[PDB]
Amino acid sequence: GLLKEYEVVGRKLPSEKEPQTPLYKMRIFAPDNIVAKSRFWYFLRQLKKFKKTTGEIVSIKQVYETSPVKIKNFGIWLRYDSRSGTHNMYREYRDLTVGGAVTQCYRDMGARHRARAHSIQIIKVDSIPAAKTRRVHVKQFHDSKIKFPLVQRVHHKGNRKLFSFRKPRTYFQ
Amino acid sequence: MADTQAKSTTAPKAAKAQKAPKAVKAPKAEKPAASEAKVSAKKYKRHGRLFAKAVFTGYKRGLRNQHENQAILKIEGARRKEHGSFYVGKRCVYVYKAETKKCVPQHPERKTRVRAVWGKVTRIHGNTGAVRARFNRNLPGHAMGHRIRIMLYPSRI
Amino acid sequence: MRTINSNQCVKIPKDIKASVKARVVTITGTRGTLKRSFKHLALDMYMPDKRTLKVEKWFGTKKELAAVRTVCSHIENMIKGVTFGFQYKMRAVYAHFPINCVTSENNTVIEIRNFLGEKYIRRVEMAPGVTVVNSTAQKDELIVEGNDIESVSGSAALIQQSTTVKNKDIRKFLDGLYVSEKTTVVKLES
Amino acid sequence: MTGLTNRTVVIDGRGHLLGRLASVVAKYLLQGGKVAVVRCEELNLSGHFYRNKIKFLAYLRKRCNVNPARGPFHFRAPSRIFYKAVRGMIPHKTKRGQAALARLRVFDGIPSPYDKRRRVVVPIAMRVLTLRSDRKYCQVGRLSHEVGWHYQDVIKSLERKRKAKLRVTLKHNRELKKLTVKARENIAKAAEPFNKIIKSYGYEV
Amino acid sequence: MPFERFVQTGRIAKASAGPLKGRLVAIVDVIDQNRVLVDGPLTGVPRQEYRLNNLHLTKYRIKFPYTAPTRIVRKAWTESDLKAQWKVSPWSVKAQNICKRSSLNDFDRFKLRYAKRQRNKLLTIAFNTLKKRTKADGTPRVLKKDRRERLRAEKAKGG
RNA sequence: AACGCCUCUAAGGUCGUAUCCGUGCUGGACUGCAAUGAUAAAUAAGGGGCAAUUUGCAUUGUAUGGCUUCUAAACCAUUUAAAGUUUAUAAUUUACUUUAUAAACGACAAUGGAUGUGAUGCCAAUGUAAUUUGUAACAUAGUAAAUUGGGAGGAUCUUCGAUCACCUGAUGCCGCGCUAGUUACAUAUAAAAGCAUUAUUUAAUACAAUGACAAAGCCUAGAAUCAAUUGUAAACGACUUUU
RNA sequence: AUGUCGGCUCUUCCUAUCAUUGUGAAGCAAAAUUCACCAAGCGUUGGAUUGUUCACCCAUGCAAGGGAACGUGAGCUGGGU
RNA sequence: UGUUACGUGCCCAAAUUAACAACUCAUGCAGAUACCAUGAAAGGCGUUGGUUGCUUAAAACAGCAGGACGGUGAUCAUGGAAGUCGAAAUCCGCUAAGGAGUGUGUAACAACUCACCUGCCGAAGCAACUAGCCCUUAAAAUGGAUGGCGCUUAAGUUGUAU
RNA sequence: AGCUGGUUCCUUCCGAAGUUUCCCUCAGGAUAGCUGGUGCAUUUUAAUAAAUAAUCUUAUCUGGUAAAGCGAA
RNA sequence: UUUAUCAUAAAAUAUAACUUAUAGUUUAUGCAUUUUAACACAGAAUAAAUGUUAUUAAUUUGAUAAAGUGCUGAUAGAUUUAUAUGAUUACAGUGCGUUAAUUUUUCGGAAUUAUAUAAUGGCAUAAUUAUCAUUGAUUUUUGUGUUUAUUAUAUGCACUUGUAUGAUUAACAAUGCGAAAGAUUCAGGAUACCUUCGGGACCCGUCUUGAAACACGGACCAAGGAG
């Protein structure tokens, strides 16, 4: 569930008589180098036949988030499978990570729709520049002059005393 | 940051006293330039020193396999796996009350109305600083929520 | 959605001072003294040192958001109750057999006799500081009046609920004391 | 009193959730911490007044038909409702569990010597901390009176009487506490046996 | 709004969870509800985003240019003399005290307790005539009133 | 309010069943518990009782190497998640209650053990101990030992409700203790053989309870049940009556 | 070798509520009944015939709802089988 | 003696996790691990996230105010219908806009309604779909069963980390 | 008596089948299969492979199910 | 990505003349002051605020792989009949008698450098052979030259409580005690059985697919009693 992004390429077997089968690639969200290949064939199958082990892997390579301190809005376009009911989504996530966005995605999808990690298909990734954010929740973050109340707290339990005689003390002023 | 951890980790060993290396600060705090390298923990409860106030409140069990040859011992001051790891090695004693004597001269002469069962502490049971203990006898389990007693002999430096 | 800020403003008149310790707001006007507890919701009162007080919501979904406007309107009802007063009016519809409403000062209960010539006397508990006045030049109108809006119209509702017309057509036996008007006692002009 | 640590922990049942408190207490009894729980009418259980009322009414439906006096004791009191919650969490069918129940004392409306005693908070049990905002909750003493607890009226008078003795002791305690701090502060600087130990401690007391 | 604590730009936060732990930090930018971009260059924590569940927010609010990279944060922090206010901060001195409540190699512990009994005598020994209660007394004397004037003045006396 | 609005509903709030649950009615926790009475045995005897006692001595727990403990004063009164703990000035109160101004621990890190919060301990002990320290000075802060009478108050399963306080007045005089600081003088324990000292792992002592041999120091002199008997009672015990 | 059916006797519950309580519907005007709800707390019977549950009739009462433990033969009866 | 499958509030060995993000608040089997000890068809402006199409700054969307007629009872069904039990049908005119008419219904006329365009509202909102949990549906019989206590920012449900 | 009931010490090691066929057979046998025991002959599958047995793969055959078809019989 | 720095867009976050309001207060329904998560990218300007191109920093940051590089704690085990009829052998330390030089301690000593032989890597050169494509690399094999490092051989004999010798537990030490018969003291034990604690244990025989069964025999015990 560990969200690492991987470039996988796969040609379809190698004959000397028979030249240079075409080279397809994908970006794959996987914790796993193996899951990177696993999803890669399944999505490759959807356009272009190519069953592993009439299938040639090629190279498995992990790709490098360009800006993990970078403060960006991503739109992901998503397909999920419901019980009687496969449908399409666009949702927008504000994350450090394209990796972090997807990880927050599988959790969010899982929750609301009952969203199966196996029942979810990714679709597409783009970084949203600039007011193309339909995103009512998202566009709240873009707002000049972003000060926001800290609402509530979170009470470590109890203490370094199991026995807290100094009463928490919901106050905080 | 793997390098930075390595540099940061030289510093507490330096302070200990010695082998004489690295300084690369660490706080013990005024410090001229450090709130840097962190406020303890902590995770407590007490005794400590003849005897950690200790509880025999269990045996090491399977769901319904009693397996008493090792016991679970909760050391009061040990919340954490780190703290209970201090106690890994220590000798334990359970001193308890008898109506009837038994034992005459070899060392002292105990009027054996006071009986002692002697044990050692072993490895760290708990996510929450309970520890395993082996005893030479083994503790009868009539000792449950009875206070058992852990002397800080054997302490390594 | 968990919208982080939604604010409402309640405009306070010059004659009235409203002093909030906690969520209990004690308002002192010209007609007197209204205390109501907003203590169940947990909402915020800010005086932007005006007479106007702003009541706000932070980090509360949709249900919480909707309840901020109940209080703004509720405090507006206290402000309107201490200058203007609240007044509710009730008709007493009988096709022949007169709904006879007796009592008053105030210390009323509300004794309903000869509805629908049923010997049964129903007596409907008078709620505290609501007063009832029988209306002059308006034939059998009972007016239920009090500073606190909830108490008054709830007192007016209880006398509606019993006369309930049992076992016989409510559409043809129009028979009942039904609330006709939701109104204010005093203000504006004249 | 004499314990592994304190043989009497007087616990304030105020703003504790009933099962959260019961479970942590059950552990403490097994550990040998011998606890007394006071103000179980001030004990809260989550889920609306009404929702709790119907849950609790479901057990009295349970009744041993042949001789119902063999049959389930539907314990009215909030102290006894707390007691049932703890007892179920303990293996009370064993003789070990009998010892553990004897370690436990449960009182509604804090009497005898427990009132000049400090009611300790268990912070896991705390309703205000654990329970989410805007969630309606029931108070156990309200629930108790519905299922037939006679003594709701009785305890409320006994609690008021207790609070009044507890008010006068507080008032004198606060007065005394002023006069103790001045009597340290005024002798402190005036030689050095208070300057030596306080400022060599220098922590933050 | 009385003012509860704002997740604001520059409201500061002393982040408990981290390799940062106990370092004082300032909120650069408000990310998402869960996170804030935080930079504390004078406490020497490098720039990172971190979760608002890892950090709990301070009283201290300094007019901050919100969106500042490390250099301008470091320039704005020593202009605020923020570190110096944070040493005055008596609850941070109390936070530096638990780094000292640690050990105080047991030698120093019985300093306290030997000498606490110096003060513990002197309390009971200062005690017992205001107004409040009553308060009193006209003894029964020659030692007892000369023990009360043995606070006060302290000549001639007993007995 | 959502849905500028509007609406029994989302939040909050009112009435409302032959229901339900109490009141009530019925068994009465076999011994779950309270209150109160007499508290024996009679003298050639002694017996019990206050025994919480007090002594030789014994038993047992505590602390177990003084003590390497411990604590029935004690962080409110709450709606409660902007909910909130307080101080002070100006008012206000029976109520950390109520009002305005200024701040403040702005559910941070803090805090949660101890402020041991009537500032405990493990102190007293100026050699702190399986001995106790004893004895001299200086100056500062400054300590107190005893008895009796009277007037009012308190008690929710609680270790003595024919008990324990508080206050006020009176009596005198054992001067019994003195402590902390600094400083003088002297010494037993301590040298526990052991170089591997933990191993069979203590007890002088301290505190709390219990004991009782012969003896000692105070107080007081029941009834139950069976027989016989009633009928209000009943198969028999038992119930209710009796001399 | 797990004592058929009914009827006599006796039990407790369940509703999918006919009556009664409190209620919402009605092409309910009144009267009356029908529908639906919370509800089994409380009723739901006396006979002719049948061995009969079932059935079919008669009479009253506002109303003569329906089911579960093939209930119930060291309880009966032994009538049908 | 060491480590796993299945689990981890406690019962009952074990993190009320020194992690985390949602969803759900359940009055009569809220829910609680494959087999499995049941739950649907069909509904829901409860709540939650999606999809698509709208009105519109020449002021919109809710909500009031205000017109809702005339060529012409145009007309056929006449049992009665001027707009309206029903229908062949159905276009002009006046126009800012008003259907030979969406209904309320007098048996008719008529009086009400909505479209259409306006005064205010001058910036939000409205419709049709998808599917999670919850709720409705979903009622049965000795008292009773996620195995129990109990659990509501879960100890549930989905996903994720030690 | 093909039926029912019972059958008398222990340990060690290996360890089934309810199927085939025929039978007035079908509550049972025989028979084959599964089971053990007894061993025997040789170990390049044996005592100080260029000989296989049987499972993948490969190479070389077969098939009318799933799917598809009905503008194919 | 980020630090440090340059140019451009550009200041869309903040700072910044100034414009406005509520309001405590002040002045006299309105003003002036100031405070206000109440105003306006509001002017020039500033921090390049963000984006883009360039340069970087002990080059970051993430991941993964690798070195007995160095090292600590704890846990359980430790057959040892090693001549019943089978091994005790191997290595290492230390001393012995080749020298020198430099350095450290500065005493005793210790290290490194100065040889021949063999192997190996690294440089250059050449041939083959396979390969990615030929700019250039990689592979297997072989030879040659140069220099350097590393490693092994040329290091025997004596002694040794040195390391292992393939289940290598003992140095070292304390304590009980075998104290004649007599008999103390220590350790150890689900004998019978009692106690105290946890956990587990349903009735055997049998037919049967399955038996604790609301299946059948068996009250209990002795002795006869069946491949």
mmCIF file with all atom_site columns, C-alpha atoms (C1' of nucleotides) in Angstrom, chain A residues 53, chain I residues 54-61:
data_model
loop_
_atom_site.group_PDB
_atom_site.id
_atom_site.type_symbol
_atom_site.label_atom_id
_atom_site.label_alt_id
_atom_site.label_comp_id
_atom_site.label_asym_id
_atom_site.label_entity_id
_atom_site.label_seq_id
_atom_site.pdbx_PDB_ins_code
_atom_site.Cartn_x
_atom_site.Cartn_y
_atom_site.Cartn_z
_atom_site.occupancy
_atom_site.B_iso_or_equiv
_atom_site.pdbx_formal_charge
_atom_site.auth_seq_id
_atom_site.auth_comp_id
_atom_site.auth_asym_id
_atom_site.auth_atom_id
_atom_site.pdbx_PDB_model_num
ATOM 1 C CA    . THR A 1 53 ? 5.209  -15.249 -20.602 1.00 0.00 ? 53 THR A CA    1
ATOM 2 C "C1'" . A   I 2 54 ? 8.602  -41.402 -13.390 1.00 0.00 ? 54 A   I "C1'" 1
ATOM 3 C "C1'" . U   I 2 55 ? 7.282  -35.978 -13.055 1.00 0.00 ? 55 U   I "C1'" 1
ATOM 4 C "C1'" . C   I 2 56 ? 8.489  -30.860 -15.697 1.00 0.00 ? 56 C   I "C1'" 1
ATOM 5 C "C1'" . U   I 2 57 ? 10.049 -29.295 -20.320 1.00 0.00 ? 57 U   I "C1'" 1
ATOM 6 C "C1'" . U   I 2 58 ? 10.666 -30.027 -25.319 1.00 0.00 ? 58 U   I "C1'" 1
ATOM 7 C "C1'" . A   I 2 59 ? 9.290  -32.453 -29.824 1.00 0.00 ? 59 A   I "C1'" 1
ATOM 8 C "C1'" . U   I 2 60 ? 5.476  -35.265 -32.139 1.00 0.00 ? 60 U   I "C1'" 1
ATOM 9 C "C1'" . C   I 2 61 ? -0.034 -37.089 -32.109 1.00 0.00 ? 61 C   I "C1'" 1
#
